Design a protein around this ligand. Structure first.
Ligand code: MOO
Length: 227
């Protein structure tokens, strides 16, 4: 058996790859999805994850500083982009530029991950700060513990705007993209892949996630493959 803990934005891609791997090997693949913060803290407390995939560098560094992953047992696997979303049927087009006034374009709540801890929220806070929007954005926030909880709040029309990854917008027919954050507003969205337990089965799955077969699945869902 191999246990994989993965950022919630990876739910669909990793589910697809788990089914492929189980058809190709006599191995059971157990998956757990949540915010990268929650998952890293659980591993620190002893959760038996063999493999961890974070939605940012920071939560993998968090484990490395605790000696739970070695520098040579992690690789930058995927990239993403940050987007604004709206419920389908309440479409908007908003330019993520300092010239835009967030008090004019955001007239309800803004749903995203917790800006202190969840990767999507940390990237969002970087962008708001870069744009000079933070003190006008913060009073509007509804914060969740992973990006998919935020996606669902917007999909159900419970929040007028959300901030999710491009791949999250693509997976939900119930939300539309209202704007794409320029890359220079935040740190690059990078997913490090980490081998936490070093054994035969875990090493094989860690290599499989880097394989040509896995590339096709990640690209299908809209992730970029990192060089
Ligand atoms: O760790 Mo996430 O994929 O930003 O919820």
């Amino acid at each position: 058996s191999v246990t994989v803990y993965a950022a919630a934005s990876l739910t669909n891609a990793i589910n697809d790859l788990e089914k492929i791997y189980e058809k190709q090997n006599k191995v059971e693949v157990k998956t757990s999805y949540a915010g990268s913060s929650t998952l890293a803290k659980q591993i620190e407390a002893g959760a038996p994850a063999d493999i961890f995939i974070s939605a940012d560098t920071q939560w993998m560094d968090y484990l490395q500083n605790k000696k739970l992953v070695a520098a040579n047992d992690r690789i930058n696997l995927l990239g993403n982009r940050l987007v604004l979303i709206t419920p389908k049927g309440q479409s908007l087009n908003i330019k993520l530029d300092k010239a835009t006034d967030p008090n004019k374009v955001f007239t309800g709540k803004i749903c995203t991950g917790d800006t202190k801890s969840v990767p999507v929220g940390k990237y969002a806070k970087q962008a708001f700060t870069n744009l000079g929007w933070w003190n006008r954005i913060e009073p509007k926030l509804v914060e969740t513990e992973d990006v998919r909880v935020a996606l669902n709040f917007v999909a159900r029309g419970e929040c007028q705007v959300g901030i999710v990854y491009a791949t999250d917008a693509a997976i939900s027919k119930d939300v539309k993209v209202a704007g794409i954050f320029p890359e220079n507003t935040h740190s690059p969205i990078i997913y490090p892949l980490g081998l936490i337990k070093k054994n035969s089965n875990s090493a094989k799955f860690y290599q499989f996630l880097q394989s040509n077969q896995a590339k096709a699945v990640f690209k299908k869902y809209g992730f970029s493959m990192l060089a």
